[PDB]
Amino acid sequence: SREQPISFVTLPSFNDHSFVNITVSASFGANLIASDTTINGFSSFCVDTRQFTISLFYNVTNVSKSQDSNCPFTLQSVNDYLSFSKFCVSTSLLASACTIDLFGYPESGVKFTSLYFQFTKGELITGTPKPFEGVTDVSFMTLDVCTKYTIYGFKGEGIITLTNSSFLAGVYYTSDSGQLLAFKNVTSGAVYSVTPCSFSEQAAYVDDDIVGVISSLSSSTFNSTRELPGFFYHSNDGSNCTEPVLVYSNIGVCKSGSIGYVPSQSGQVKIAPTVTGNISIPTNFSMSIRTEYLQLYN
C-alpha cells in the first residue's frame, strides 16, 4: 500500500544541555606549519548532562575538509538523537574507543586530528541537534499520523497510536523480529502502539490492469469498498460476482472486479447397491476423456 513529522521519546527529563565544542585550528599548501585541536578548551571532555550536542568548528589558514570514521556514528549524525549511557571524546587515545580522523586538503593533504570516542549504550545521554527552550518535558511525539521516530533508541517510520493496555514492567515491548511494537510513557503510564505506515496487500490483476485489491486498509483510490470477513476489498464494481476469473479458496474475482463467493463444485453421483426396493440403473452412456501428466525423468 502507499516531510514526515519527527517524534522523539526518552525516559522523562527537562532541558539539560551542554555543548561539546571541537575546534580544529591549523595553518598551512606546504602541509602544516601548525595545528591544535581542543574540546571545550581541554584535551578531553566527558558528557555529564542528559542532552548534548557536538559542534565541529574549523579555524584553518592558507582548504577542503573531510572525515574518515571508524565509529557507529559520524560527527554530524551523533547529534540526530542517538542515545548513550556514557560518552567521552578525547584527542588522546581512550581504551575501547573508536576513531574519527579529520583531514584537510589545502591546495598534499594532512591529518588535522584524531578524535577518540569512548561510549556505552543506553538511555541517559542523548545527542540532540540543539538545546531545548521552554521545555519541562524533552520528549515529544505526534500521534495518529505517519511519523519518523526515535523511540527509546529505536529508529524508523510508523504510526503511533494510544492503546488501552497497561503493563507494570519495563519501558518498551518488542516483536520476535526485534521491532518496537509498543512503548510506555513513563510519567503517565500510558502505552502506545506502533504500526508501519504501509501494509502488504494482494492485487487482482486481470488482462492488463488492476481489477481490485484485497487489503487491511479501508482507504483506497477505488470507488467501491466492501468488507469481507478478514479483509477489505477495493474495486470499481461493488456488485455480485457470478463469473470469477481469479479464484482462491472460495473467493472469486470477476473481470470487472466484482467479488463474491464461489459455490461448491458439484460432481458425479454414484449409486449405492441395494437388495430391495426403488433403485436406479445407469444408461445412455457416452465417452469422456480425462487428461493426466506424470513425469518420468529428470
Partner: protein, 343 residues
Amino acid sequence: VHGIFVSGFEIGISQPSGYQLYLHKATTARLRICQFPSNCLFNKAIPAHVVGITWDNDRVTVFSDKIYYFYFKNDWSRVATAMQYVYEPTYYMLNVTSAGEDGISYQPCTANCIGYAANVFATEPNGHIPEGFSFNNWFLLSNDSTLVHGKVVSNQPLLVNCLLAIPKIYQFFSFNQTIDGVCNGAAVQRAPEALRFNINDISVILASIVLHTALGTNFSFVCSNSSNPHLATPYYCFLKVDTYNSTVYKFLAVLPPTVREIVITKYGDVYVNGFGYLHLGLLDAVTINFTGFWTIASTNFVDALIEVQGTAIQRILYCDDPVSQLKCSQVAFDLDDGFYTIS
C-alpha cells in the same frame, strides 16, 4: 461460593469450553479438572483424610494434605457437592516458631492484611521462594525490552538467602558478608549478589540510599519536590556522585509516579520496575537510612523457569533438582511421559 470446604463425599465447581472441577473421596481423593459435559487439565489421586478447594482470579488452590496450586484462566461462580460455603475472604497472622503443626498462633489479622499477605513470605531451607507466593512487586530484571507473555528460562536474583519483613532500619548491607537482621523463615549464610527492595511507601526514602563502590566513590540518590538549594543550576532525582575530592549532582530522571521495586546488584546494575536504568561500577555495599519497605531481601542469581503474564511473574520453578533441570531444558512446568535426554 469462592471457597467450598468439608468436615463417599464430593465437591463440584462450575461456571463449558473450559475446565470445571470435580473431587471425590470416601471413608485419598480423586481430583479431576476436566472438560466435563453437563481432555483434562489434571486427573490424579491426592492424599486426603478439613478438606477444601479455594479459587480466585486465575488460580485454583486445593487443600488436601499438601496444598496444590493450579494456574489456569478459570471462570467459576457456583459450587455443588458439615459444609462451609465461603464468599468473602479473611486474613490471619500466623506465628510459626515451632516448625511443626503446633503453630503458635493464627491471630486475626487487623491491619494492612492484604499488603502484608501479598508481599511477605517465609523462606524455604534451600533458599527457594515458596510455591504459592504471588510475586506482587517482583519483576524480572531485563536491561532492554519486556517479556509480556510466555515462558522463559533465565538467570535471575530469585534465590533467597534472607528476607527481612517490615524492616526497621533507623543499616549497612554488604555484598561481602551476610545481611544482619531477623530473617523470615529459613536463612542461608551467604553474601547477597543482589538486594531486592519491595516498596510500600516511597515517600519514606524521598523524605537515603547510598551505593558504595569498590574504588571509594559514594553514589547517593537525592530526590526533591519543589526544593533545589544545591540542585538548580513531582520529584526529580539526582545522583550525587561524592568522591574524596569532589561532589556533583547528575540529573537522572523524573521519578516515575509509582515505584514498586528497586534491585541493586553487586555489579552495580540498579533496576526500578525491571528496566536496568543505571549501571555503575562494582559495589561493596549499600547503605539504607530512613526512620517504607514491605521487604528487603538478600538474594542470589539462579537459573529458573518463569511464566510471565502481562509482564507479571507467576509459577517460578528453580532449576536445581535433576527433575527440575529436565523441566527447565524442555521449557515446560509439566512434561508428558517419555524418554528425555539428560547428561
